[PDB]
Every structure is written in C-alpha cells, then in structure tokens.
Design a protein around this ligand. Structure first.
Ligand SMILES: CCCCCCCCCCCCCCCCCC(=O)OC[C@H](COP(=O)([O-])OCC[N+](C)(C)C)OC(=O)CCCCCCCCCCCCCCCCC
Ligand SMILES: CCCCCCCCCCCCCCCCCC(=O)OC[C@H](COP(=O)([O-])OCC[N+](C)(C)C)OC(=O)CCCCCCCCCCCCCCCCC
Ligand SMILES: *P([O])([O])(=O)O[C]C([C])([C])[C]([O])C(=O)[N][C][C]C(=O)[N][C][C]SC(=O)[C][C][C][C][C][C][C][C][C][C][C][C][C]
Ligand code: FES
Lengths: 39, 64, 112, 63, 144, 100, 51, 99, 116, 146, 172, 120, 148
C-alpha cells in the first residue's frame, strides 16, 4: 500500500498563526485561498 | 511588535533553581467575606505579582 | 624555609563566634556522640510510657520492647524530630532495633 | 435554558409520594469549574472580572 | 575537687556566682533517665582527679528552675564553663568523653591570654542576654 | 571472589516466590523502557532525530546520552506524570532537608 | 543598624537634614530638587526592599 | 452526555455491586468529570480510581461521611456550636428537633 | 561647632568609611552609595556658594543624574542576585569563616562521610 | 601478567575495579575502572556527573599520580575533581600531599576530612568496591559553562 | 515532580537563594509547601492487602512527620505533646485495623491525606481537627480534670457507672 | 520654600494631632473591648492567614522603576531651559531639542524590547 | 538467542535510518549542511524558539495576544488503559543487587512485604479493636504536677 500523505502535528488545529498559515498556503496567496477581506 | 514569549511564560525543569518558583508565593484566599467572592466562595489563590497562578476553589460553604 | 608539614593558611581558619571552644577543623563534619544519641533517644522513648527504660536492651526488637507497627513509626518520627533529620524510606522501613537507629544517627553528620 | 445555562433535573421516582432521587445539574457549577482554566495567567482585577462574567450563583454550585 | 550537691536553684546559683570559678563543671540530673546513677558515679570519680574544675551537681527534679536557666535539654547534662560562659556540653553519660572534654577545655583555657580587667567571672545568662539585646531585641522590635 | 561474564561477582539470586525477585524483574522491565543497562546507565542504540546523542534501544528510547546516568526522579516524572501515592523520602529529598 | 528598612529610613533622614542644611545656607531650590529626586529614589528602594 | 453533531442525549448507567464501590474515573478524558466525580465520591462514597483530584468538594473540613446515602439521616451526626471554654467553634453530638 | 567646609569634607569621608564598615549587603551598599553622592552634591553646592562659581552649582544636577544611573544599575544587579543563587549578604557566598557572623556554618551536601 | 606461550587471554571482567558512587542527586552508581588509570579518567570515561574537572588532570609531566611524586611537581591546578572517599580506602590512601591539601582547602565549596582530588587518585587493585560520594563541584571560570 | 509533595515544592530559605550558594534544598516534609495543592490524584489501586497496609504505614509516617508544625500553627501544643498526638492518632488507626478491603483502605488513605492537608494549610479550625489528636481515656493536658467519677465509683463496673449516670434526661 | 515659620507650623500640626488624640481618648471612655482569641489576629476574609512575615511580592516592574528614575532625572535637567526659555538662543534651542530627542529615543528603545510590560 | 534477535532488529532499523540518510537529494544535503552550520551557532533561546514553533506557539506579539489557546487551553491527552492495569506502581529505584551491602540498606525493604504477606495470609479476618474510653488517670502527671 502507498504511504499516507504526511500530516503535521501543527495541523488539525482549529486556528492557525502566521507561520502555520505560511506553511499551509505555500505556493498560493491569502487572497487566492481565503478571498479578499474587507473592513 | 517583537517576540516576548519568554517574558510571558516560565516553565519548571527538574531540579532547576532558575526555572523553579524562586519566591514565596502569595497564597492568599479569595475568602467568603470578599465583595467579589459572592460571600460563599473560598478561592485559595496562589498569586505571583497579582498574577493568578493556581486556583483551589473551596465551595460548599453554602452546601445545605 | 618551606615547611610542607605546616598545612595551615588563611583558608583553613576555623574560628567561629558560636564556639567558645574552637573546632578542630573548618569542615563541620562533627557527628554526635554515642552517649548523647542514646540519651536523646531514651528521652524520646520516655515519651512512650509502655516501654521500660531501666532494662532497655538496644539490640532487642521494637516488638519485644512493646512497640506496634504505628508505635515504631511514631518513635522513628519523634527521633527524626529530636535530631532534625530525615530517614530515607529504605532506612526507615529497614530499622529493626534502636541499636540500628543509633548506628545510623552516628554515621550521620547533619544530626543536631 | 436557564439564564446561566442548561439547568437540569434528574428525578428517579420509586412510585411513592417522595422522590427517590432528585439530582440537580447546575450550569453555575460547570461555569465555575472552567474558571481556573480561563483565569490562569490573568491579574487579580482580570480574575475578579472573570468571576463576574461567568454569572455564577453559589446556591446552585453548593446546593 | 569534690562534688557540691544542690537541691535548690537559687542556692546553687548563689554558690557558683560567689565562688567565681575559672573552670566549672555542672552535672544536671533527673530521675527519668536510668543512666543518671552511672553519671553520678562518673562525676564523683572525675571530681577528685581534676582540681582545676569546680564540680557542682544539680538535681533537676528538685530544682526545676535550674533546667530553664542553664538551658538543659536532656539528662544527664554535663556543662563545662570557663569564667561563667559555656565552653562545652555533654548530653549523655560517658566517662571517657567527659574526661576528654574536661581535658580539652582545660588545655584551651590554659592557652588563653585575657586582657587585664577583662578576665572576670560572668553569670551564665550574661552572654545570652548580650546576644539577645544585639539580635533578638531588634528583631522583636521590628516584627512585633 | 569469582565473577560472572560481567564484572559483577557471582551471588545467589533471590528466592523464586519472593517480592524481591518480583520487584527485580519489574525493575528490569522498567529499565528496558528507557534503554538502561543493569547498572542504571543509558546505553547506545539507534540515532534519534532532534535529540542529539540520545539513542533508542528496543523496548524504548533513552533519556540521555549513551553510557550516562539514569535519573530516578526523571523516570518517576515520565512514568507517573503527576501521581504520588506517598511523599517518598529518597536520598535527594533527605539531603535537601538536611541542607535546609 | 543592620535592618535594611531602618538603614533606608536613616538615609531618608540624612537627606532631610542635608536639605535642612542647604536651606540654612540659603540654597532652597537645590533643597527642593534634592528632596524630590531622593524621595522618588527612596520610594523605589522601599519597593525593592519589599521584593 | 450531549452530542452536538447528532443533537442527541445519551445516559450511560454503570452498575456497582462490589462493596468498595470502585470504578474508573473519566476525569482525565472529560474536564467536567473533575468536580462532578468529586461530588459523586464525597456524597455516595464512590472510589474513583485514576482520578485527577480526590479532595472533597462540598463537605465540611475534617469530616468523613457520605451524606447522600439512604442510611445517613438528614439531621446528620454532628452539630457545630460555640464553646466558651475553647473560645472557638466545636462539634458535638446533635439533639435535633423532631416534628 | 565645625566650619561647614570641614564638616562636609569630614562627613563625606565618614560616609565612605561607613560604607566599608557596614556588612556587605548589596542593598545597603547601594543606599550608602546614594548617601555618598548626596554628600558630594551638598559639598559642591557649598563650594559654589562660597566661591560664586556657577559651574560648581552645575554639578548639583549632574551628581543627581550619575547617582540615578548608578542606582538603576544597582537595582538591576540586586534583581540579578535571585537568578544566580547568590545571597544578598555577600558574606554568605563564601566558605571562609568569620567571627563577625553569629550563625555562619556551611557543610558539605552529604549525609554520611564514611560507609562502614 | 606473567603469561606463557600459548596461554589464552584473560577476561576484562576479572580485571575490573568497581567504584560505587553517590551522585549529587544522592543516586547510587557503579562504574568500572582499571589499575594504572586515574579516578578522574575513570569518572570521565563513564560520564559520571558532578565532577567539573576544570584543569583536566593537571600537568602531563611530574604528575600527582606518579610513585613517588616528584618534588618539582606543580600539583593540582584546581579544586574541581573532589570526591569524598569512604573511611577504609581513605585510610589506606594515607595523608594528603601538601599541594593537594592546599588546593582542597582553597575551594569555594565546603570540603570534608575524607575529601580527595580525583585526578590525584591512582586506581589500584585494593580500590575494588570503593565507595565515594560526588557532591557538585564549583565552576571556577567563565568557560566552565562553555 | 509536578505534585504538592514534589521535591521542588519548597519554600526558599532566602529571597535570592533556595538553600545556599553551593546547594539547593528546602523543607516540605515537616512544614507546608511553597505552592498550594491544585490536584490530589488517586492512590494507585492496591491489588494486595500488603500494599494497603504499606499505604497506611506511609500515611501515618507523613502525619507523624507533620504533627509538630500542626501543633505550633494551631496553638494546641499545650493540649498534647507531639508524641501524645501521634499516639492518639495511632489509636484512631488501631480502631480501624480490621479493614481488609484494599480499595476501601485506599479511599480512607485519600481522605486522611486530604484532612492532613486541610489541617496543614489552616483550612480547618484547631478546635475541630483536634478530635483525631484528642486522647481517648485521659484528659487534655491544658486544663484541670475531674476525678469525681473515678473516686465515687471506685472499682465499680462500667455497667454500674453507666447505670448511676443514665442514658436519658431525668426530667423527660 | 519656607522657613522656621514652616517648621513652627509643622509643630502646630503636631499639636493639632495631639488635640485629635485627646478627642480619641475621650471617645475611648465610651466603650469596653472584650479580649477574644481572634480579635487581635490578621483578617483574611474570615479565616486564619497562613503567613505572617513572609508576604513577598514578585516586583515585575523593576524596569519601569529604573526608567522612572532615569526619566525623572531627565525632566529635572529639562526644567532650567523651560524656566528661562525667553532668553533662548540657537545653542540653547538645539540642546533642548536634542535632549528631548534623546529622551524620546530612549523611550522608543524601551518600547521595542517589550520591557515596559509585566514578566513571568 | 535473545541478544542475537535484538542485534538483528537493531541492524534492520539502523539500515532503515541509513536509507533515510543516504538517499537524500543534493538540495536536501545542502539544506542539512546549512542546518548543521546554523546549529553550530544557535543559542538556547533559538532552540527554545524552534521547539515552541514545533509545538505551535505564537511567534509574534499579535499572536502572543492568544498565547493561552496553544500553551494552556489545549487539554492533556488521557492516559492509556495499558498504563492503568499495570503490575505495581512503586517509585522506580536503582536495582541495588550488585552494589555493596552498605547501599542495599537504602533500597526498598522487600522483607517487610514478605512478612506482611505472611501476616495477612495468617490473619484474613480479625476482630475490631476498641480503644476503651473509660476515664483513666493520665500516665504522665506533668501538666498537673509541674511547678515551674
Ligand atoms: C529638625 C528640627 C528643626 C530645626 C533644624 C535646624 C534649622 C533648619 C532651618 C534653618 C533655617 O531657618 O534656614 C533659613 C531658611 C530660610 O532662609 P531665611 O531667609 O529665613 O534666612 C534666615 C534669615 N537670616 C539669615 C538673615 C537670619 O529656612 C528654610 O528654608 C527652611 C525650610 C524648611 C522646609 C521644611 C523642613 C521640614 C523638616 C522636618
Ligand atoms: C478631651 C479629652 C477628655 C478625656 C477624659 C478622660 C478619658 C477617660 O475617662 O477615658 C477612660 C479611661 C478608662 O475609664 P473607665 O475604665 O472608667 O471606663 C469605663 C466607663 N464606664 C464605667 C462608663 C463603662 O480612663 C482613663 O484612662 C483615666 C481617665 C483619667 C483619670
Ligand atoms: P502492624 O505492624 O501493627 O501489624 O501494622 C499495622 C498495619 C498493617 C499498618 C495496619 O494498621 C493494619 O492492621 N491494617 C491496614 C490498615 C487498615 O486496615 N486500616 C487503616 C485505615 S487508614 C485510615 O483510616 C486513615 C484515614 C484518616 C481518617 C481521618 C484522619 C486524617 C487526619 C486527621 C488529622 C490530621 C490533622 C490533625
Ligand atoms: S581536575 Fe583539576 S585538580 Fe583534579
């Protein structure tokens, strides 16, 4: 059987800090993934 | 701002004097006769510079 | 001339205010004397009035002396209070007689 | 839905005129139980504010 | 010397303060300890062989005030004093150790050179009261 | 006095049905969990990522460098995280009391 | 006196008497400045002693 | 228990017939179980093995009893009075009123 | 009874002597350092008044600034004693005996020296 | 050894001197040493804690481990390899060398009457099952923590 | 150890040192600790009456090591000496020596440890925690006692002593 | 700054305190105090305090205290130029502005390193 | 035989580790070299930062506003029932079997357990001990017969 995809322990967290977000959105942008945030 | 995590928390290592509580903790009780204790709570409160460190809430002073 | 047999220097000074009779050396490794330990333990035992101090046999077991399981624990704790020491669990549980207790206290340098 | 949370009563009746058991689940008990979890690391004034905000009545907690 | 026995605290204190011995050995005894009899015999035997010490025997049971004044914790107590202040103590009964500490105190006092006018007998509580006023009095004033 | 394959002298073991023998076997099992030899010393083994020179054995991973001293307090902390049935007075606790 | 609280109290009294001298010598402005600065210093020293 | 995903209520009943009333404690799984199990243990004498905190919750200091049992009377066994000879509160046998 | 010049020089050196005289507790030495700086402050004011020199009166605030900086550094160093397991009474940080201390008695951290 | 031609080698376990140690945390260790080595070398090989060993055995010529000790020796260069030996082997060791005693008394931490410097102790066959205690030794310079 | 009885839960000797400049240490065995007890985990269940008895002995040892401090802080050192309190609590335990359920003994040990902590931290009043230290057949050592019953009922049986006293008020 | 008249007024304040003392004693005539066990003990919300002399603080604001010392010194140094600012020149203006700039720079450095808050 | 089996298993796992190491690409090897040279100059503060980052701790001030949610608010994982049903729970101690008899006096007293087991096997059911509360004269008269 193929090896499972690697899942970090810092994942599965209800919320992410900036370093977690940077690891998660690698290759993309905050607006490219979450869309635009407005005030 | 910059990082201040080391100034925010203090862990305890085994037999480490620096990491231990190098101070007599102010183990005051938020006792019954206190305006903010509602009169029937004895909250044994371990403080470190008024920082609430440990809680031992004695309840049942109104247990009937 | 360098007298190598004179091992004295300012670091070896052992004059203290609390001792009118000066100590032999700076190291405070003075163990209590056997008669002092025996008299203090005799007082501690005199606190337990089911034991006769007149015919006390130091090699005799606590059970033969008249001490139950709790009395042995109480007696050893009282001895600890008297000498301001703590017995490690193995030593505390392995004490068979007052002679063993006295020997352990004699080998101790923190007893006061 | 009491104002302090889910106030529950568990009644076991044996058929008589008296309840065999009347257990009371008070929301204030569970609210006070989380106070050490949320109060740690806060100043004394913050702890007083936290005691105020959980809306705890000690008749429910002690009962 | 020889053993002077006292059943009263005030009489013993008056005798010791009037005599003003350069070297004194006080043997405090009580009836609770069964080893005081051998302590009595050892004190009597050591009294003759040491003429530089004044040997005084106090019974704690008949003189309970003596135990508090001399800070006796356990009996038999052998207190060796030079010029009124404590040089050493022996809390148990052992003739060899008692004679050894008598010899040590005798030798050390022999080796001393007190200044003129500062070699007078003092009461037993004088040094304790000096330390009390220098330390305990100030601590009490600060705390209570 | 004759010696075994190890440098320790040959002595008769405890009786089969003794609490001493039972506790000795249990202590051997406990030592196996921390990669600890019969003398109380961390041994070598497989390298561990992010733990420096600390190695891993078979039944567990060491808590120190190879050929080091196994700490009884560390073992108690790791095994029983917060459970103390009684205030056990060890040599360290007795010495701390004496120092105080 | 070895009690640090009494040592600090006597330091404070010394500051007061220095200011009294400077007032007697008719240097009162320097008295006021010395007093304010050293009273703040003694306040922080009392806090340090409490620590 | 209440399950939010299934919007359901569950009630698990565990039967105890051993005299010591010993049962494992889920205090290390559910954070609610600390004070709840302390109440259950102090009121019914349940021995919760492997429990985070075993201290009493609602009972008086220096008192060992299980009031929430059918054997235990409502009036209890002790009453707290003020003793002049002690200048403080003492505990004595209670002679309570009966209707 | 003494002239003010004599008194102020004398008591400046008296403060310097008392600082050494007292037991070497860091907080006490810090207090005596502040007192020494204040003595210098008063002496500078006295000499400025005598000789009509504004430069000597200038050292009044300069001495205050130097004393404040040194006091802040001393506060920080006293705080630092906690993390290095160092007694504030520096006489207790060494094993050398001295009769000045009633209670100084340091022993090795061991129970028994001889095993049978 | 006085081996003969064709004789097999001898077991290392039969040539091991056992040192029973009480570590500063009051813990019992049992380490192996070989005759001809120093106690400091044995302790450092066995990774025994509590021995700072700032000077690391002193000088390499005219050492304190030689028999007899050369009069022109400089002796120990610190007081960091201090071990409290038990009474029998301490008596068998004899009286201290004057330089070793000078370094022992010039120690910031308290010593004992059974205290010896580990690098001044030469392991011998009679030191088998030798009991020592190793309380924590002082750190002398800024580089003791480097 | 992250416990109230842990070796690191000791009140520092000074404000800048634990014990000395060369060693650490503290006293939490004979006095109270530096930090309050947040949690008191269950005694590990004992499968043997042997282990239950060992737990009882260790609890009694902990109590005995702590009784001088309790007497000092509660001002009851005149009512009984430390050894008298130890003997009275030993009598209390002897009245419970017939226990044979290891689980019940573990529960009793937990309750006793909690009560000891209560008396240690001034949670309970001295007039209420002294009932365990109070003597059984002898009076308290801080007040005068009456031997009228002993003299008037000289060598009479316990039955007669109860009979002359009565078990109910005589007016109703 | 005052004078011997200020000293005499301090004496008069002490005499006023003596008057208040007399009133308090006269009030003391009107009640009786009964000795009780805990009447003269410490109050800790109805239960005995577990500490008497060893009530230690943590003092997490020693950086704030030392900065208070330094900045009080700086403000004292700033006082003279502001008192006589009407006679300012290029030199005095430059020195005052540079000193205020140094104070601001020190404050900003204190802010950057998070030393103005509480520490654990 | 057990020694040989453990040797073989150790060699298998060591070969697995070597395969993990030797089969790295050139970029991974360069990253490892950079990591080693960085660890050659990392302070204890940097190592603590790395460990906290791996634990999910905040690394900015705005995130430090929510320190508790990661440092403290995350509950401890429950223990295992395997840990629950263990043989015994005595504190771990060094096996003082080859140590001298001087050291064995500090080890747990196993003879006490044997004696207690014998006693409880011989006494399964015992009668309740009743301490008599009938008034008795004090054994020491000191509180009522002392003058000073
Ligand atoms: C302490 C007991 C009080 C007396 C101490 C010695 C005298 C101190 C005052 C000396 C004085 O009057 O100096 C003149 C100056 C005033 O100068 P002056 O103008 O009155 O000068 C006197 C006039 N001739 C010289 C012509 C005679 O006094 C002050 O400035 C006193 C300020 C007091 C501030 C508050 C002090 C409280 C202390 C508690
Ligand atoms: C203005 C100040 C007037 C003070 C008058 C005296 C104060 C006084 O009597 O104090 C009461 C105290 C105690 O007085 P006392 O003990 O008689 O008070 C009890 C009063 N009755 C009987 C009403 C309950 O008096 C003194 O200390 C002595 C007073 C002077 C003689
Ligand atoms: P020996 O050698 O005498 O046979 O050994 C006796 C035993 C084996 C230790 C033992 O006594 C025994 O026979 N059986 C085991 C113990 C047992 O069965 N029951 C003991 C019960 S433990 C107990 O009940 C303690 C609970 C405390 C109750 C309240 C007191 C707590 C503290 C209160 C006071 C503290 C401050 C004043
Ligand atoms: S290591 Fe330096 S004296 Fe031995």
């Amino acid at each position: 059987s193929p090896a499972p995809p690697t899942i970090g322990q810092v994942e599965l967290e209800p919320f992410k800090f900036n370093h977690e977000r940077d690891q998660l959105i690698y290759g993309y942008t905050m607006e490219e993934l979450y869309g635009k945030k407005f005030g | 701002m910059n990082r201040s995590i080391f100034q925010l928390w203090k862990p305890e290592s085994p037999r480490s004097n620096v990491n231990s509580k190098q101070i007599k903790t102010m183990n005051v009780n938020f006792g019954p006769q206190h305006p903010a204790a509602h009169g029937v709570l004895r909250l044994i409160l371990q403080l470190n510079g008024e920082i609430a460190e440990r809680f031992d809430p004695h309840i049942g002073l109104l247990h009937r | 001339f360098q007298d190598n047999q004179d091992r004295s220097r300012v670091e070896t000074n052992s004059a203290t205010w609390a001792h009118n009779l000066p100590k032999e050396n700076k190291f405070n490794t003075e163990t209590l004397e056997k008669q002092e330990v025996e008299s203090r333990i005799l007082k501690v035992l005199s606190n337990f009035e089911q034991v006769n101090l007149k015919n006390l046999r130091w090699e005799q077991n606590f059970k033969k002396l008249g001490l139950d399981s709790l009395d042995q624990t109480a007696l050893l704790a009282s001895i600890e209070h008297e000498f301001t020491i703590l017995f490690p669990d193995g030593v505390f549980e392995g004490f068979e007689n007052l002679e063993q207790v006295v020997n352990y206290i004699l080998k101790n340098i923190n007893a006061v | 839905e009491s104002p302090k949370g889910e106030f529950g009563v568990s009644m076991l009746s044996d058929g008589s005129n008296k309840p065999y058991k009347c257990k009371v689940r008070s929301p204030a008990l569970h609210h006070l139980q989380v106070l050490p979890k949320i109060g740690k690391g806060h100043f004394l004034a913050d702890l007083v504010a936290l005691v105020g905000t959980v809306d705890i009545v000690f008749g429910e907690i002690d009962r | 010397s020889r053993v002077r026995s006292f059943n009263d605290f005030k009489a013993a204190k008056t005798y010791i303060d009037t005599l003003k011995p350069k070297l004194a050995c006080l043997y405090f005894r009580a009836d609770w300890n069964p080893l005081c009899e051998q302590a009595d015999k050892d004190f009597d035997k050591l009294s003759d062989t040491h003429l530089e010490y004044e040997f005084v025997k106090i019974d704690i049971d008949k003189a309970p005030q003596a135990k508090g004044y001399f800070a006796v914790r356990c009996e038999p107590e052998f207190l060796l004093l030079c010029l009124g202040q404590e040089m050493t103590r022996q809390t148990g009964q052992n003739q060899r150790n008692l004679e050894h500490r008598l010899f040590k105190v005798q030798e050390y006092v022999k080796g001393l050179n007190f200044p003129a006018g500062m070699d007078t007998y003092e009461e037993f509580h004088e040094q304790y009261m000096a330390e009390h006023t220098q330390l305990d009095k100030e601590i009490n004033e600060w705390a209570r | 006095r004759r010696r075994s394959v190890d440098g320790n002298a040959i002595r008769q073991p405890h009786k089969v049905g003794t609490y001493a023998a039972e506790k000795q076997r249990l202590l051997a099992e406990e030592r196996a969990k921390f990669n600890v030899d019969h003398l109380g010393r961390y041994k070598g083994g497989l390298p561990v990522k992010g733990k420096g020179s600390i190695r891993k054995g078979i039944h567990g991973e060491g808590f120190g460098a190879p050929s080091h001293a196994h700490d009884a307090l560390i073992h108690q902390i790791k095994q029983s995280k917060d459970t103390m049935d009684y205030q056990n007075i060890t040599n360290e606790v007795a010495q701390n009391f004496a120092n105080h | 006196n070895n009690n640090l609280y009494y040592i600090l109290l006597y330091i404070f009294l010394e500051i007061v008497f220095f200011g009294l001298f400077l007032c007697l010598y008719q240097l009162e402005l320097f008295t006021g400045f010395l007093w304010v600065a050293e009273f703040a210093i003694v306040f922080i020293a009392v806090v340090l002693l409490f620590y | 228990y209440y399950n939010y995903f299934l919007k359901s209520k569950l009630t698990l009943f565990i039967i105890l017939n051993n005299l010591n009333k010993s049962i494992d404690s889920i205090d290390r799984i559910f954070a609610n179980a600390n004070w709840l199990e302390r109440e259950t243990s102090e009121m019914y004498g349940i021995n919760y093995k492997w429990k985070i905190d075993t201290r009493k919750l609602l009972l008086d200091y220096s008192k060992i009893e299980n009031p929430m049992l059918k054997e235990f009377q409502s009036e209890g066994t002790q009453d707290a009075f003020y003793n002049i000879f002690e200048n403080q509160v003492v505990v004595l046998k209670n002679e309570t009123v009966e209707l | 009874m003494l002239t003010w010049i004599s008194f102020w020089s004398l008591i400046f050196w008296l403060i310097l002597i008392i600082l050494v005289l007292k037991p070497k507790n860091f907080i006490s030495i810090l207090f005596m350092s502040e007192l020494t700086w204040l003595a210098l402050y008063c002496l500078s004011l006295l000499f400025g008044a005598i000789y009509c020199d504004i430069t000597l009166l200038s050292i009044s605030f300069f001495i205050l600034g130097v004393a404040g900086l040194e006091f802040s550094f001393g506060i920080l160093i006293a705080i630092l004693y906690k993390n290095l397991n160092e007694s504030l009474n520096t006489d207790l940080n060494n094993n050398n005996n001295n009769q000045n201390i009633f209670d100084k008695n340091f022993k090795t951290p061991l129970e028994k020296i001889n095993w049978q | 050894h006085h081996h003969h031609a064709g004789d097999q080698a001898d077991r290392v376990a039969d040539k091991i001197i056992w040192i029973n140690i009480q570590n500063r945390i009051g813990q019992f260790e049992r380490i192996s040493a070989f005759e001809g080595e120093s106690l400091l070398e044995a302790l450092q090989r066995n990774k025994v804690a509590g021995i700072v060993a700032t000077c690391e055995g002193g000088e390499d010529i005219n050492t304190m481990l030689e028999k007899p000790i050369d009069p022109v020796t400089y002796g120990p260069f610190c007081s960091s390899c201090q071990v409290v030996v038990s009474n029998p082997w301490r008596n068998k060791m004899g009286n201290l060398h004057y330089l070793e005693e000078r370094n022992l008394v010039r120690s910031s931490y308290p010593t004992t009457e059974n205290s010896r410097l580990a690098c001044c102790i030469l392991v011998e066959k009679w030191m088998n099952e030798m009991i020592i205690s190793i309380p924590q030794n002082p750190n002398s310079v800024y580089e003791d923590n480097m | 150890m992250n416990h109230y009885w842990g070796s690191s839960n000791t009140i520092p000797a000074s404000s800048t040192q634990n014990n000395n400049y060369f060693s650490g240490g503290g006293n939490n065995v004979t006095i109270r600790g530096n930090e309050i007890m947040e949690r008191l985990p269950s005694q590990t269940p004992s499968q043997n009456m042997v282990q239950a008895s060992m737990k009882t002995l260790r609890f009694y040892r902990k109590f005995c090591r702590l009784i001088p401090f309790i007497l000092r802080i509660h001002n009851i050192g005149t009512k009984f000496t430390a050894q008298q309190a130890m003997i009275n609590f030993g009598n209390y335990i002897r009245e419970r020596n017939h226990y044979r359920d290891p689980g019940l003994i573990d529960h009793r040990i937990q309750l006793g440890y909690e009560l000891l902590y209560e008396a240690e931290m001034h949670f309970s009043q001295h007039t209420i925690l002294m009932q365990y230290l109070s003597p059984y057949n002898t009076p308290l050592s801080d007040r005068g006692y009456s031997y009228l019953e002993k003299v008037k009922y000289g060598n009479k049986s316990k039955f007669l002593q109860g009979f002359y006293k009565g078990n109910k008020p005589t007016e109703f | 700054m005052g004078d011997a008249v200020v000293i005499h007024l301090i004496q008069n304040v002490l005499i006023f305190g003596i008057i208040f003392w007399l009133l308090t004693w006269g009030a003391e005539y009107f009640y009786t105090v009964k000795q009780q066990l805990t009447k003269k003990q410490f109050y800790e919300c109805g239960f005995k305090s577990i500490s008497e002399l060893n009530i230690q603080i943590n003092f997490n604001f020693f950086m704030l205290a030392v900065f208070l010392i330094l900045y009080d010194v700086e403000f004292t140094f700033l006082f003279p130029v502001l008192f006589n600012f009407s006679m300012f020149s290029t030199t005095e203006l430059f020195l005052a502005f540079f000193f205020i700039f140094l104070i601001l720079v020190s404050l900003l450095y204190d802010w950057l390193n998070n030393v103005l808050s509480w520490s654990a | 035989r057990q020694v040989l089996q453990e040797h073989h298993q150790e060699c298998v796992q060591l070969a697995r580790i070597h395969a993990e190491e030797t089969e790295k690409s050139f970029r991974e090897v360069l990253n490892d070299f950079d990591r080693i040279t960085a660890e050659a100059e990392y302070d204890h503060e940097s190592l603590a930062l790395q460990k906290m980052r791996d634990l999910g701790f905040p690394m900015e001030g705005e995130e430090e506003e929510y320190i508790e949610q990661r440092v403290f608010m995350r509950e401890q994982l429950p223990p295992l029932e395997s840990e629950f049903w263990k043989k015994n729970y005595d504190p771990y101690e060094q096996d003082l079997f080859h140590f001298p008899d001087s050291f064995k006096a500090y080890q747990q007293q196993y003879k006490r357990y044997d004696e207690a087991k014998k006693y409880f096997e011989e006494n399964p059911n015992v009668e309740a001990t009743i301490i008599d509360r009938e008034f008795k004269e004090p054994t020491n008269k000191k509180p009522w017969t002392r003058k000073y």
